[PDB]
Amino acid sequence: ENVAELKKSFNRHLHFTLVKDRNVATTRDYYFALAHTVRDHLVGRWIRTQQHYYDKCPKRVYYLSLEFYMGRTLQNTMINLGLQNACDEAIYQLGLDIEELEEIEEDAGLGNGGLGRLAACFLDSMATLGLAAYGYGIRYEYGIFNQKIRDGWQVEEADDWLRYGNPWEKSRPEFMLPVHFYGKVEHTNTGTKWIDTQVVLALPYDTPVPGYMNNTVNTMRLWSARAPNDDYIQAVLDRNLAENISRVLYPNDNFFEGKELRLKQEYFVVAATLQDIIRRFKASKFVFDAFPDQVAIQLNDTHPALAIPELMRIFVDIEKLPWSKAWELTQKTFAYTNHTVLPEALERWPVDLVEKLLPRHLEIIYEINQKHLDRIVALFPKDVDRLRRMSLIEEEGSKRINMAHLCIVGSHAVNGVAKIHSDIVKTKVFKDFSELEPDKFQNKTNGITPRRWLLLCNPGLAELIAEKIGEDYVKDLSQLTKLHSFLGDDVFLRELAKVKQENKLKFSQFLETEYKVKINPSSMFDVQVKRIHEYKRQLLNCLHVITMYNRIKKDPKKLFVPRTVIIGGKAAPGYHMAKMIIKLITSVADVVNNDPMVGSKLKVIFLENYRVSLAEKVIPATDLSEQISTAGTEASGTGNMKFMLNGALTIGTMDGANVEMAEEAGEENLFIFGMRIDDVAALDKKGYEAKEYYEALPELKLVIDQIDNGFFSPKQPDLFKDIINMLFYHDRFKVFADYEAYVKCQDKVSQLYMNPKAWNTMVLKNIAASGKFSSDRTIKEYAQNIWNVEPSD
Amino acid sequence: NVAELKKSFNRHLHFTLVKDRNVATTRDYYFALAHTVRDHLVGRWIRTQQHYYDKCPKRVYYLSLEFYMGRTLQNTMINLGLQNACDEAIYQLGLDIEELEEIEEDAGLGNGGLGRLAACFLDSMATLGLAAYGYGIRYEYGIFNQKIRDGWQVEEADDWLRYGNPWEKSRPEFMLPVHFYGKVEHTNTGTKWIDTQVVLALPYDTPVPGYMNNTVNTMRLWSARAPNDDYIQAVLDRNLAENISRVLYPNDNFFEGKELRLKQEYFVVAATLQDIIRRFKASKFVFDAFPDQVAIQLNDTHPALAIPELMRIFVDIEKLPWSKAWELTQKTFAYTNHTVLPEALERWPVDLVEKLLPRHLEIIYEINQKHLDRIVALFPKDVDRLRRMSLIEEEGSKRINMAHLCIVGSHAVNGVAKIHSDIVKTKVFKDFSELEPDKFQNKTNGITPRRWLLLCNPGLAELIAEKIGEDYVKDLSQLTKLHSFLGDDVFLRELAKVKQENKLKFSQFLETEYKVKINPSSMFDVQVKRIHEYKRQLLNCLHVITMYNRIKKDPKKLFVPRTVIIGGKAAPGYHMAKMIIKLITSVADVVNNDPMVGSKLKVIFLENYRVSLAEKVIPATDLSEQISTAGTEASGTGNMKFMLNGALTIGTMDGANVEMAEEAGEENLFIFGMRIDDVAALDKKGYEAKEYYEALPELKLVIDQIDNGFFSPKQPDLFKDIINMLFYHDRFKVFADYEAYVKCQDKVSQLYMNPKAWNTMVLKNIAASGKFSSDRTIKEYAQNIWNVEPS
Ligand SMILES: O=C(N[C@@H](Cc1ccccc1)C(=O)N1CC(C(=O)O)C1)c1cc2cc(Cl)ccc2[nH]1
Ligand SMILES: O=C(N[C@@H](Cc1ccccc1)C(=O)N1CC(C(=O)O)C1)c1cc2cc(Cl)ccc2[nH]1
Ligand SMILES: *Cc1c(COP(=O)(O)O)cnc(C)c1O
Ligand SMILES: *Cc1c(COP(=O)(O)O)cnc(C)c1O
Ligand SMILES: CC(=O)N[C@@H]1O[C@H](CO)[C@@H](O)[C@H](O)[C@H]1O
Ligand SMILES: CC(=O)N[C@@H]1O[C@H](CO)[C@@H](O)[C@H](O)[C@H]1O
Ligand SMILES: O=c1[nH]c(=O)c2[nH]c(=O)[nH]c2[nH]1
Ligand SMILES: O=c1[nH]c(=O)c2[nH]c(=O)[nH]c2[nH]1
């Protein structure tokens, strides 16, 4: 692992592994040679780590999720193994540029957004905390689509991420497992049998998860679907049908699409995972009574809800345990995390679909529900409507299964991902269940890993911090509070601002080479990157942008703090409003960026193909972080945390974790604005009439009229009709209701920005208070209050 | 040495497979050893390709839809001179070398002889140091794995890439786009093919090591990938473009005009020519010198589209004038004809080609117009000559005669054995050969002595080497030196011992798989090849039943016992072939369970015959059944394998059987039945199967038994379709050779009773098989068609 030896290993791989010499090698070949050179460093500790779990049998944690938004692996691995500086030197001596090799790697974009990225941060924190934890998901052949912008509109291109090979994954043939679908059920005198099923094989692929500087390397096991081997041509081609189960990730963020294929993916990952878990338990040097003391399975949202009735199926139908005992061990095994409260995102599978595909699971679900309601009928004999409300089944016409209800009764703990969120989940949405079981509902505020989101993406900052207070903060982020000691340290504030500046220059180079636009390197980088959603409101942001443009058009010489406004994110393919909003933004940017009067005063960029590796670039270069969801809509958020950690100030609503960010850093140190949760409720009751604000606010009217009259789309004056219509008559995210307070807030931001010392002092107060948001703290609370597992430091 | 090989093995097990000894699976050990051996290929492979770039010798491109490679581990260890050392390392590591080798999947990207010939050719060309490349398709599924259920063949997908193939190397930087459908636009800027669907071609290189010479050549196989410009359905529909290289069409000697198959043919052809042209432009070489640097061999008519594709490239893209382009095209291409069976002839319907490849149809018409215009000038009156020589067949359904396209587009056309080449030249393509005599040639097939001797039969190879040295491996003609042992009884017993060892080793195989108990004392009678009416395993079956009915009558007669093995795959849609298999499993059930017969005779249908199995059953064979109707087996190569391995041949004067007889002495082979002329006369006179049936009492019983349910009591008329074919539609004259065949078989048994005489004849066969080395075949191709030299 020294420089001379890394060059030798690199040359060795280029030769024997890539079959090339320095004359014919491609950049991809060099990336692969380096990837293998680094990968070899994981082996020893990966084998030892998994071997140690078997010998000492610590209770294991299984994080079951349909998503793992991993981003790239090369750099992350080098950093957690302490190999980056040496590799950087080696590659440089070989006459190459490691950063260029790094760009060849495809993101493992096996997720949509926060839910999937939370899982990824969790694996890093769990390996860093030394827990015997495993991530279980699906090895999608195609991840979240690559986004292109054509004529101002989003276009989707398949993310063929495995086309050239994934050196970071390991096929595990010996652990293949069969998964069953369809068929029929038989209640024989030897137990109930699920027969005449269609079989799809699940081949597992393991990816190492290195902890930060601790010799621990855990595993991420992703399952891939394969047709079993018992017109000939057509029969062989049809093998594709089974293989389509793990073909592509469903691209919806916070939205439920009840497609049968999605249901197939859900049972696929759940069946393979649990059978693999039980297999390992049975081989452990451990009857099943100890199962719950040896296994904890965390449900990442309701997507893997079928795991509950699958575990019961295994215990009852296979292991021959009596229902009562099976049920007991089941509840003690599962814990569920609720990640959302938007109606349209709720998973409610029609009973008929479940009956056809998973007949044995439907039966078990009905039983679960029966024992569920019988107990309620007991405690509350009269309340008939209570039974209707707590039922796992919704019989209102098209009968369907309420997966969240199934997760609640089958789990011993249910948690939200931010205080305000967990409160609403416990006291509103699931009141009937929490009153019945107080101690079941918990909170576990989200977090982000400071390796990827600090050390990796912003080395200049990580280094500056380390020089002031040491490196202990990497593994204990609450150590950042020591930074408070430097609030009056002028030289340190200058050093802090220089790091932001350099990040800004570096990213301005990315922008200019990727887009036409000329970037004012000194302007304020106002950023909003996240999935496109009406509730996240990049639309509100767009109104503010148009507002700023008009102010410039009117008073061209007024002292204006220059800005580069960046907005990026993917829209789900079938989400019409989301796609219209993107087109609006690109249209606005085209006018702004090409109007001679504004020039270098204001530049607008719709950041294309926002994904993990691109978040690592833009976040460190950000001055103002846009976290403006309508109060009550963002369960927690985590992008908000990344910006805080990287030196940006936040303009947002009192929503999700924005509330706890305010508590930690001091509310005066964030630009909070708009309606809070109570204001939204009150405005609801009264009835929200969008027209009022439009008529009542002149700057807003001009904006609205311009969008509506074709100012931003001359060739198609009515192009934005749907946006206008939704805004006046169907906006449940009250865009106009926060417009005023939002714009007033934005002006205060510009005011502060003119005061570099005041601005950087507040930045320091944010960075110094960001410690709570490390996923290491989130995982400690999960380990202690839910999984009952302990580290190894 | 051995210490370093063991060290690399442990290094690969650890870093490449992520395992230690107490957790490794047998498959990890195989992969670890494969990687250890593979590393030894790299230096020479890089050097060999670099050398071709540096000295720019003319390059040979063998374009085929099939490469029946089999397993690669052992073959690589042998050709690299590493087997003993690796055998030692694995032994010292406490592992079973044979167990690891059996883990490897056959790369079965071929149907039978056509695809195996390409593989043997790759090995010989690399061993002769020719700058040669193989170009084909990387099918996800090769020829299906065959199982027998209730006596019938059942097919399973050959998912050979499931666990990974260490022997292939993806070459991402050489991915190319291939076009389909679309339309032709005739502009003032020059005719363009527009609005096409695109499919990417990703090449994968597999190294081809020559035997002990530092040469490592390349076999480049193409895999179809969808390009990247309802969302979910759009992503799933990428499966459609990728279906082009999904599976090998399971037909041997049969034309199935499916569209997907036409797509595969254009795919390999389009990717291949573009890549070849790209390599020409990058070389240190206008195009005038293209044919002096490039030779492309068309393996049968399957890649015939390559002729109009090269023209399309030269003309539509490179803007060369038609005349110039056509001249270059003919000098580049050479066509190998592999069959004369009418059902095997590729004739694509014009409508299909126009829909999928409209610009190629226009080009084909043009080539045809210019072609017929020449014929009109040389024979003004001969109207029918134009009809017989046109690439187009206008009768009702217009279709393209791909064979004709290949002939007019090539400078050399060859068959694969004397008898066949003569038929192709003076009969099937008489109007063409008469116009250009020199164009048609012969190149008798061969098999590589590495895979088919040194590897599959180490015992025989060691015996031969002990007596005549090792020079024969690279110069098989040296086998004639074994004649010096014609009298030696010590050598003859040695020879018989080796055969015994193989029979014993293989017998152990047959019983762990089959219920039957083998008589080790018995003569191994083997017919392994694809199930075909023309190959006649049916005739063989008539003999087995004939033999059974003889034992039943005279249980006490002195009889040479036999283990009769017949094995082969039937094309899934080939009904007769499938009936024939059911007939054989049925007959075997009756014979194998009859108390009165017992160890006197046993029958086995060898399931899943394929390259790795062939390597086992061939060296254990005493009698090789090569009985196609005279004129139907263009050449055959299994005949040659058996000859090299110590088996005597019972066969017709067909394909290369004729030449085997010329080399070893007609009396040293058991030749029988009708010859090309006799079949010709019988056809003239008309064939009435009933006659031989009436005239031959042993035959009558055999048939009545089949037809009345003797071999299928549960379903008495099960073989009705077979009876109907033998009597009123048997164009391969099974009954007409029944009598001579049975008599011939009796003579085989006679000689078998005399061990010294039997092995004396084997020696004469092994000593005369030198001609059948693919190394001899390749040299002829090199000198007379491609105009290239070794190194
Ligand atoms: O596949 C080889 N190396 C591998 C190296 C590799 C492995 C994993 C990820 C990226 C690269 C290779 O090039 N790829 C695997 C990818 C795929 O599956 O498409 C691409 C290889 C080396 C080699 C050397 C010889 Cl001599 C013969 C065959 C060989 N294959
Ligand atoms: O895939 C790895 N090695 C390879 C080794 C290999 C390569 C080619 C054929 C067989 C085996 C592997 O196991 N396979 C490629 C096959 C496939 O395509 O499914 C199976 C590998 C090694 C490794 C080491 C670490 Cl630390 C992490 C991930 C890793 N993957
Ligand atoms: C962190 C992250 C998210 C979640 O961001 P929010 O602003 O909390 O919605 C989404 N996508 C990517 C690529 C991320 O890295
Ligand atoms: C050699 C070979 C053949 C060709 O056999 P013929 O008897 O010439 O048809 C067919 N299949 C396999 C697997 C072979 O090795
Ligand atoms: C269904 C879903 O994707 N929910 C998302 O989950 C992440 C992780 O908890 C939250 O931060 C975010 O606010 C929320 O929208
Ligand atoms: C079309 C086809 O598969 N033809 C086969 O080709 C091989 C290779 O030349 C011959 O040995 C054999 O007789 C013949 O049947
Ligand atoms: O197809 C959709 N995907 C979504 O993510 C979404 N969100 C929404 O409101 N509608 C839709 N539609
Ligand atoms: O599907 C078929 N494959 C063949 O190889 C063949 N041969 C034949 O005569 N008929 C058929 N059918």
Swiss-Prot record, chain A:
Record PTM Phosphoserine, positions in chain: S485, S522, S600
Residue positions, PTM N6-succinyllysine: K325
Keywords: Acetylation, Allosteric enzyme, Carbohydrate metabolism, Cytoplasm, Disease variant, Glycogen metabolism, Glycogen storage disease, Glycosyltransferase, Nucleotide-binding, Phosphoprotein, Pyridoxal phosphate, Transferase
N6-acetyllysine: modified positions: K431, K757
Enzyme Commission code(s) on record: 2.4.1.1
UniProt GO BP: glucose homeostasis; glycogen catabolic process; glycogen metabolic process; necroptotic process; response to bacterium
Annotated catalysed reactions: [(1->4)-alpha-D-glucosyl](n) + phosphate = [(1->4)-alpha-D-glucosyl](n-1) + alpha-D-glucose 1-phosphate
Keyword Nucleotide-binding: yes
Consequence of changing K431Q: Decreased glycogen phosphorylase activity
Activity regulation comment: Allosterically regulated through the non-covalent binding of metabolites, being activated by AMP and inhibited by ATP, ADP, and glucose-6-phosphate. The activity is also controlled by post-translational modifications including phosphorylation and acetylation.
NCBIfam families per record: P_ylase
Protein name: Glycogen phosphorylase, liver form
The species this protein was found in: Homo sapiens
Gene: PYGL
